[PDB]
């Protein structure tokens, strides 16, 4: 906004985005599906939920 050899001035526009939480969850586990093998009419088959 101003530029002398002994003086300066600047302006900065900052925009912020604050997420407001509804609930916070701390003690958490990841799921790992393993399933089960089934041997049916000769064929081996992997079964999963």
């Amino acid at each position: 906004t101003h530029s002398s050899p002994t003086a300066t001035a600047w302006e900065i526009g900052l925009y912020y985005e604050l997420v407001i939480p509804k609930h916070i969850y701390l003690n958490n586990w990841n799921v790992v599906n393993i399933g089960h093998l089934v041997k049916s009419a000769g064929q081996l088959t992997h079964v999963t939920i």
Binding site: V31, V32, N33, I34, G35, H36, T48, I49
Partner: peptide, 23 residues
Amino acid sequence: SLRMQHPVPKYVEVNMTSIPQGV
């Protein structure tokens, strides 16, 4: 002379547990 190798018994303990629904 006659060298031989006689088998002698031993064992290793192996525990196993289940995984309900496979999860």
